[PDB]
Amino acid sequence: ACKDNLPAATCSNVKANNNCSSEKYKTNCAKTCGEC
Numbered sequence: 001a002c003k004d005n006l007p008a009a010t011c012s013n014v015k016a017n018n019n020c021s022s023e024k025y026k027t028n029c030a031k032t033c034g035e036c
Contacts, residue, residue: 002036004029 004011011020011029019025020033030036 001030004031008032 005028006014006025011025011032014020014025014029015032020029026033026035
């Protein structure tokens with residue numbers, strides 16, 4: 001699941017926002033989320 005539909009800067013903020021717990025980013029920043 002190493003895919004990035006969003007930039008690292010955004011995913012970083014997503015991760016830094018804990019928004020990686022949202023399905024909105026669990027399928028856009030899964031790589032940052034750690035799904036990969």
